[PDB]
Design a protein around this nucleic acid. Structure first.
Ligand SMILES: [Mg+2]
Ligand SMILES: [Mg+2]
Ligand SMILES: [Mg+2]
Ligand SMILES: [Mg+2]
Ligand SMILES: [Mg+2]
Ligand SMILES: [Mg+2]
Ligand SMILES: [Mg+2]
Ligand SMILES: [Mg+2]
Ligand SMILES: [Mg+2]
Ligand SMILES: [Mg+2]
Ligand SMILES: [Mg+2]
Ligand SMILES: [Mg+2]
Ligand SMILES: [Mg+2]
Ligand SMILES: [Mg+2]
Ligand SMILES: [Mg+2]
Ligand SMILES: [Mg+2]
Ligand SMILES: [Mg+2]
Ligand SMILES: [Mg+2]
Ligand SMILES: [Mg+2]
Ligand SMILES: [Mg+2]
Ligand SMILES: [Mg+2]
Ligand SMILES: [Mg+2]
Ligand SMILES: [Mg+2]
Ligand SMILES: [Mg+2]
Ligand SMILES: [Mg+2]
Ligand SMILES: [Mg+2]
Ligand SMILES: [Mg+2]
Ligand SMILES: [Mg+2]
Ligand SMILES: [Mg+2]
Ligand SMILES: [Mg+2]
Ligand SMILES: [Mg+2]
Ligand SMILES: [Mg+2]
Ligand SMILES: [Mg+2]
Ligand SMILES: [Mg+2]
Ligand SMILES: [Mg+2]
Ligand SMILES: [Mg+2]
Ligand SMILES: [Zn+2]
Lengths: 209, 175, 38, 142
RNA sequence: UGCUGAAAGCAUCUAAGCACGAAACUUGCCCCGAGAUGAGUUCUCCCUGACCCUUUAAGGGUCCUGAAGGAACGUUGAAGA
RNA sequence: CGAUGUCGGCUCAUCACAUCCUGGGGCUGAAGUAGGUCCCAAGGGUAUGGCUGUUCGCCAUUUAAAGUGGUACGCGAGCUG
RNA sequence: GUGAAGAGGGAAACAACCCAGACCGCCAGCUAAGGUCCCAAAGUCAUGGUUAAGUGGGAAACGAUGUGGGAAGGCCCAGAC
């Protein structure tokens, strides 16, 4: 089943009648409008290409604006692509609303996580710090040993070392959808999705069920 | 060898078609088809099938003797059919048939249902007895093995699904 | 299943069979006699 | 005088279609590597690619003898420390069958920049068809 | 663990044929990923001038032209050494 | 021997399988529960303290289990001394 | 005996093993050990067998109706197994 492209509005809580507070993440989902329908005869696979939001007319480029003009649709802030299941099809200028998730129960939310920058191995890979006293010479948060003596003149591939943390595509699976508000284009999922406030989110129905 | 030298007599009302290595044997109980091994030479001497080693093969008489007893069994299957009987030993163990789904009740927390294959028909005279009939001998023995495989009979009481003819060597729990 | 280097017939009902390159003793009478050369 | 050498500008190359149905793997592959090297031509030169373009189709129907269909093993290593991988022959036919002809010929070509250039002329296909009718390939019988 | 079944009138899970069988294996889940030099595919956009040259060729130059786009600069960021 | 820093701890590990746990089996002097034993299996998991410089060991209390080894008895141009 | 104090060829690489002792030059010929499907020069040679284990291409006591060859024996068309 296809997914929809939304935006992380922020987090809040839904007080139930029973006295339970559900921490929810508001994801506004405007009308995703398709820009290209891909098929087996031309493209080798079945998918649709959607767009959302608006964009400044002086900033959408002539190659990019020609792509919306062929579909005959207003330029949106990006272009995403969702693989089609069998027996599932869409027309070109079709708009897709948040009512698609009206009867799903769990979703998977894909976003780009927050950028931690260059992070050390205590923060990134959860290494233990060494001893903060008892004689330690300049080695309180260092990664310690990284290999062995002469047997493998070498550090192995994928060794956990410092580097860029976050700012990358991650997917949180099986989030309970709380409320689907079609009138003001919202989608309330239980819990915390990746991404900062205002970043693009990809909400698909849950594949692990 | 000695099995393969003894020819297999086709009766009346049993149609036999030789086609290369593919042999289709029809009859009043169904049709059966088996591609033979390429080491086997088959020919129909007008009332009997004969079975000879095709040249340029090592296991000549070995493959021919396998090809004898199969087509012997294919003849008996299409004029008599095979009938393997199973009984259930144990309290509360029973079986029921819905067309081609035997509904076993073998003391589990979940129901046991077994889908029957194509040419296999089953029947329970009693709740504690399963009688299944069919044409192909390899298939009725396989279905009987599958129904036995749910409760292989315990050696302390003989409890479980057994063949109706087999012996169950029991064992006393000593102390 | 006894697994040994030396596999032997233990009674009159033992039968030495080679199944898939492995010498195996199988007995219809006694389940203690079933063997496998390994 | 001096011994002739082929020249890469003046050398001519030809196109061949080989059907790999039922043929033994290594006995096919050594004839391909003979003709990719160019050792069937009298103007052979070791440092010059003089071999012919070869299209091999029905690559999934190549045959091996013995129990090698279930017992020949294609190892490789991913670089990472646990990264030894393993695939049998009949898994490689099901997964990506063009590699079987390709691995066998690549081991039989010379190792170096010229041997990698010789491998570029081998064009294998799992199916019974190819897009290379424009080069007018002949039916090579092996 | 079997079914059918010879070689070996029997027996036999195997030699021909068939079935089942584990957190291992390949998938399914997530991420990177066409420098995959075998450098792939799809969609859209842009450019429709004159001449000289000798060693005539995937040649060199002049004048006209400067697109799509990019880059630089600036205001900056829940992006960042 | 015109220098290859060494016991133990710390911090990162990584591999083997002669498997400690979990998985699949066979036999049992296997009623069940719980075991014994052997076969398959390296995917993941695999204590904290008291004493001692200790590895080890004993002890206390855990845990599904507290595996055995290789790695310059792994790891001092990473630390401790 | 070789190396030391000896190059060349072969044994993947491999002072001491195998072949063979480099005065120099040659885009000549024959051979040695070792080889002749491709990497890689030369037999996809010929004739007759053996192996189904990738044995070949690592190992013992011991185990087994694997299979090929030979010589002998006791049962057996008075009917064996
Ligand atoms: Mg940041
Ligand atoms: Mg600490
Ligand atoms: Mg200091
Ligand atoms: Mg400090
Ligand atoms: Mg060091
Ligand atoms: Mg190295
Ligand atoms: Mg098996
Ligand atoms: Mg053992
Ligand atoms: Mg039989
Ligand atoms: Mg049987
Ligand atoms: Mg299966
Ligand atoms: Mg020293
Ligand atoms: Mg020095
Ligand atoms: Mg083991
Ligand atoms: Mg057990
Ligand atoms: Mg592992
Ligand atoms: Mg482990
Ligand atoms: Mg592994
Ligand atoms: Mg797995
Ligand atoms: Mg302790
Ligand atoms: Mg040691
Ligand atoms: Mg050490
Ligand atoms: Mg260790
Ligand atoms: Mg140290
Ligand atoms: Mg001291
Ligand atoms: Mg000296
Ligand atoms: Mg020498
Ligand atoms: Mg030498
Ligand atoms: Mg050697
Ligand atoms: Mg050499
Ligand atoms: Mg000569
Ligand atoms: Mg010679
Ligand atoms: Mg070389
Ligand atoms: Mg050659
Ligand atoms: Mg020949
Ligand atoms: Mg008798
Ligand atoms: Zn026995």
């Amino acid at each position: 089943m296809i997914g929809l492209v939304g935006k992380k509005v922020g987090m809040t809580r839904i007080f139930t009648e029973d006295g339970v507070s559900i921490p929810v993440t508001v994801i506004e989902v405007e009308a995703n409008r398709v820009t290209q329908v891909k098929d087996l005869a031309n493209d080798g696979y079945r998918a649709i290409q959607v767009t959302t939001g608006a964009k400044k007319a002086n900033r959408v480029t002539k190659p990019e604006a020609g792509h919306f003009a062929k579909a005959g649709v207003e330029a949106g802030r990006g272009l995403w692509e969702f693989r089609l299941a069998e027996g599932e099809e869409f027309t070109v200028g079709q708009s897709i609303s948040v009512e698609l998730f009206a009867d799903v129960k769990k979703v998977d939310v894909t976003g780009t996580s927050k950028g931690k920058g260059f992070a050390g191995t205590v923060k990134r890979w959860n290494f233990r710090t060494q001893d903060a006293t008892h004689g330690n010479s300049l080695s309180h948060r260092v990664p310690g040993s990284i290999g062995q003596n002469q047997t493998p003149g070498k550090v192995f591939k994928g060794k956990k070392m410092a580097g860029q943390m976050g700012n990358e595509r991650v997917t949180v699976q099986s989030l309970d959808v709380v409320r689907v508000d079609a009138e003001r284009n919202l989608l309330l999922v239980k819990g915390a999705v990746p991404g900062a406030t205002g970043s693009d989110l990809i909400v698909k129905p849950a594949v692990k069920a | 060898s000695r099995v393969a030298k003894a020819p297999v007599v086709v009766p009346a009302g049993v149609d036999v078609k030789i086609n290369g290595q593919v042999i289709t044997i029809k009859g009043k109980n169904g049709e059966l088809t088996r591609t033979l091994n390429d080491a086997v030479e088959v020919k129909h001497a007008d009332n009997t099938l004969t079975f000879g080693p095709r040249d340029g093969y090592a296991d000549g008489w070995a493959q021919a003797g396998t090809a004898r007893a199969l087509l012997n069994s294919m003849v008996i299957g299409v004029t008599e059919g095979f009938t393997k009987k199973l009984q259930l030993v144990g309290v509360g163990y029973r079986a029921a048939v819905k067309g081609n789904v035997i509904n076993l009740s073998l003391g589990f927390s979940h129901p046991v249902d077994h889908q029957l294959p194509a040419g296999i028909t089953a029947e329970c005279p009693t709740q504690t007895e399963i009688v299944l009939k069919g044409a192909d001998k390899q298939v009725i023995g396989q279905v009987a093995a599958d129904l036995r495989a749910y409760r292989r009979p315990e050696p302390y009481k003989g409890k479980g699904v057994r063949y109706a003819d087999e012996v169950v060597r029991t064992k006393e729990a000593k102390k | 299943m006894k697994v040994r280097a030396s596999v032997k017939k233990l009674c009159r009902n033992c039968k030495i069979v080679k199944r898939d390159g492995v010498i195996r003793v199988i007995c219809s009478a006694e389940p203690k006699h079933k063997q496998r050369q390994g | 005088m001096k011994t002739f050498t082929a020249k890469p500008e003046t050398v001519k190359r030809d196109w061949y279609v080989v059907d790999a149905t039922g043929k033994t793997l290594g006995r096919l592959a050594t004839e391909l590597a003979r003709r990719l090297r160019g050792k069937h031509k009298a103007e052979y030169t070791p440092h010059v690619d003089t071999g012919d373009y070869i299209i091999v189709l029905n690559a999934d129907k190549v045959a091996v003898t013995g129990n090698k269909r279930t017992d020949k093993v294609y190892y490789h290593h991913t670089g990472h420390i646990g990264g030894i991988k393993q695939a049998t022959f009949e898994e490689m036919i099901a997964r990506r069958p063009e590699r079987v002809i390709e691995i066998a010929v690549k081991g039989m070509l010379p190792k170096g920049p010229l041997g990698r250039a010789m491998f570029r002329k081998l064009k294998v296909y799992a199916g019974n068809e190819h897009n290379h009718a424009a080069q007018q390939p002949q039916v090579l019988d092996i």
